[PDB]
Symmetry: D3
């Protein structure tokens, strides 16, 4: 059955996780983003930070923990016609923060979509994936 | 500047939105999902419904509204080696529920990832996209 | 599979629900309540109102809706050595508010327990049950 | 006046708490549960875990803390015609997690009720009580 | 005793509310704001919109309702050495949205303080007051 | 760009913060408060404690952390015709709790306003300011 894995007996260690996500743009959406309801990139960046803090409330079996660092970047890559979101979360705990990084990116992407769907309902959040993490038994991991 | 668009003077109408998302599986993850911390597909399905209701709290400029229907499906597509998530949300309001459908799919996908990252940290949430919506000025829309 | 039942096509009607709960007291707990960390009955009464509003966030398949009325009463029944909690919730919607009434009572009871567990950890929340409801196809119902 | 008791100067220690709750079934409800809106027992089990994490938000004077473990079990006891819910929560803190265990059980019970009230509005959540706890000055306690 | 006033029998009407708040700046804080952890005015503006939506969760007896419009402005008034926050909220309901407007301003002000307290811990949120409201029995009201 | 400042490498230390806020009363409001929808001072006091715990969810870049102590006082100062709110929050962390103290006072003030706006919509929350804090590099600070 589902359960929040017991990690009470594990030491408190430095954890970090970095993830990224992309939103593929149409020419219509790109134009809009270049013109600036508000700036999609700015609002999305903040939504990502807020989302990182709300992660345990969204992911059922996720361990609630105090975050000591959250960085989110939402950039427009004109030539590639897409928005790149990257998030790095840190803490000191018995479990990792991969979910916090992944959720920050996903919600920032959803926010970019929210800000541009008026003219482009077909915009796709192409990928959401982990790039790196450190801490824990498994140790350092890189894509 | 950012703002929650005023729709106070628009009539209250029947709205619907359907979105989908995918999680690409490695052979390791597929095996695990076939064996059943809990069943990833079951937990994710519920997380999606819960997420739909929490949408306005996650998307900054999203209009808060009472939902009258939420359907989420999380299925394993063995041959394609991936999990397909689909969500349909309904309501009667002055704005659409595309964000609720998109967020339900994104969070369900994040939950599948949470349940399988132990052995496969590189799993990717490949896409999150709108499939259909009805209601509003623009009328019916299909991918 | 689990789902938030579609009620989009049902008319918006006047709904009401009343529930109750009890906390059985030991002589130690009764004495404390008579002496007044704060007054358990006062804090619990407010927690119940707050809980009614948070119901859809706690009950997975519960329909989110705006409440138009919430009444909670937390009384000490000395001779019976127990605290009686009663809650009545109202709204205009396509679904009932039995869950809101039940949850308000349950959380108020949990709060009374929180305020008195220091000296009496064995206190029991004896019952939580629906007393009445009106509105909907089934019509009026009474215990 | 009400207050969140100051425990800043107390050491951080291993805490655990176990509680249980029951839902008394009618023959109608029992039949339904045996046939499986979704499986009441499965949805309730998850709601309990989620509820444990939301405890401090529901109980006014409750201390917010990171949980390191949450286990919830929702079982059908056919002969006894009732559902038994049990929850064990763990953490390392200056205060106990009795409220987290009690709330997990109460919300799981409320969810079972939500899933079966359609046909049986009179179902009763008979009891919610603490079974065990460890850690803190008072030490180990058992019902 | 406390209670969420019953307004179930009142018609659903157009409501609006406008409030404002100020943050008095020291020369140190003013300099910082002119140089731009992020832009205090931008982050605060978004926090205000988010806060408006979370109002019923923060104010105990406040009626939960769907908002149809939220506008927040956070401006620097150099000569006056202070930040002026203004918020207008709208909806269609049985109760007003004065609390939503007031809370949006208060939280935006708290956010400006958060972004500038590093160098100026003594900054004061001088006032938070209602400027206008319409709808309801009392009708239109202006400061 | 906005970011939750990284404090992962800072030691965990004892932090404390005290803030205050005022609500200026009209003779109408004063009379009401002396007569006792519920007692504004009692409801506001609890809202303040609850608000302290919800601070990180309201202030975008605020670090989420477990609080070990929360004290809130809401008093009527008849001669001065105003309500004085004071809040002290404590914890052990890498960052301070000034925001928790400030937010507790602001929300308690907003609640007093909510409870008295029926007859006095023009009531003003005159000030919200930090009175003291300890812990951190900067050390002890007093107004």
């Amino acid at each position: 059955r589902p359960r929040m894995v017991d990690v009470t007996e594990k030491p408190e260690t430095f954890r970090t996780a970095t993830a990224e996500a992309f939103v593929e743009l149409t020419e219509e959406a790109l134009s809009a983003l270049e013109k600036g309801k508000g700036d999609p990139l700015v609002v999305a960046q903040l939504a990502g930070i807020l989302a990182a803090k709300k992660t345990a409330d969204l992911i059922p079996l996720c361990h609630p923990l105090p975050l000591t660092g959250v960085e989110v970047r939402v950039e427009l890559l004109k030539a590639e016609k897409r928005v790149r979101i990257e998030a790095t979360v840190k803490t000191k705990a018995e479990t990792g923060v991969e979910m916090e990084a992944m959720t920050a990116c996903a919600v920032a992407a959803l926010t970019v979509y929210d800000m541009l769907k008026a003219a482009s309902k077909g915009l796709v959040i192409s990928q959401v994936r982990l790039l790196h993490k450190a801490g824990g038994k498994s140790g350092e991991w890189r894509r």
